[PDB]
C-alpha cells in the first residue's frame, strides 16, 4: 500500500527524461510492489519474487513467511523448488509527466525532490 510513501500525487520533482537531461516533473500516479527476496539451494537468488509464488503457505491471505523459513515455490517454468525465505520488501514506483506532455515511470530512487542536495552530475544536465 501506499503507508509510509514519502512523495504525494501532484508533488513536483526532478527526474531523468529519456533524452538524457534531467526536468521538473509532476507526479501523476503512485502505487506499491511487494517483493520477496529467496536462496535458492544452488546458492543463486531472487529479490524480485512474486509472493503467490510462493506454496508451501498462502502468503496472499496470511503475509510473509518467517525470516530465514524455509519454504517451496513454483517458479516461472512451472516447476517446484526448495528455497530459503530472506526477507519481503515494499517499494513505491512513481508516475511523473513532462512539461511537454509525455510520461515515465520511475522507481522512488531515481527521484530527486526539490529540497534535496542535487549531485553535480546532475546539476551539470539539468534544463530550466
Ligand atoms: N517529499
Given at each position: 500500500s501506499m503507508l509510509g510513501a514519502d512523495?504525494?500525487?501532484?508533488?513536483v520533482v526532478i527526474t531523468k527524461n529519456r533524452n538524457g537531461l534531467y526536468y521538473r516533473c509532476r507526479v501523476i500516479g503512485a502505487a506499491s510492489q511487494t517483493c520477496y527476496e529467496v536462496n535458492f539451494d544452488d546458492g543463486s537468488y531472487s529479490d524480485n519474487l512474486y509472493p503467490e509464488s510462493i506454496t508451501?503457505?498462502?502468503?496472499?491471505?496470511?503475509?510473509?513467511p518467517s525470516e530465514g523459513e524455509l519454504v517451496e515455490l513454483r517458479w516461472t517454468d512451472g516447476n517446484l523448488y526448495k528455497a530459503k525465505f530472506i526477507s519481503s520488501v515494499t517499494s513505491h514506483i512513481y508516475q511523473v509527466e513532462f512539461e511537454d506532455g509525455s510520461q515515465l515511470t520511475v522507481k522512488r530512487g531515481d527521484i530527486f525532490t526539490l529540497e534535496e542536495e542535487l549531485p553535480k552530475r546532475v546539476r551539470s544536465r539539468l534544463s530550466l
Amino acid at each position: 500500500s501506499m503507508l509510509g510513501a514519502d512523495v504525494s500525487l501532484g508533488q513536483v520533482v526532478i527526474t531523468k527524461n529519456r533524452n538524457g537531461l534531467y526536468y521538473r516533473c509532476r507526479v501523476i500516479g503512485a502505487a506499491s510492489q511487494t517483493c520477496y527476496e529467496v536462496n535458492f539451494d544452488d546458492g543463486s537468488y531472487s529479490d524480485n519474487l512474486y509472493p503467490e509464488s510462493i506454496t508451501s503457505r498462502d502468503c496472499v491471505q496470511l503475509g510473509p513467511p518467517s525470516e530465514g523459513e524455509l519454504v517451496e515455490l513454483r517458479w516461472t517454468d512451472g516447476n517446484l523448488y526448495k528455497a530459503k525465505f530472506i526477507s519481503s520488501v515494499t517499494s513505491h514506483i512513481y508516475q511523473v509527466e513532462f512539461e511537454d506532455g509525455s510520461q515515465l515511470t520511475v522507481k522512488r530512487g531515481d527521484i530527486f525532490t526539490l529540497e534535496e542536495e542535487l549531485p553535480k552530475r546532475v546539476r551539470s544536465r539539468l534544463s530550466l
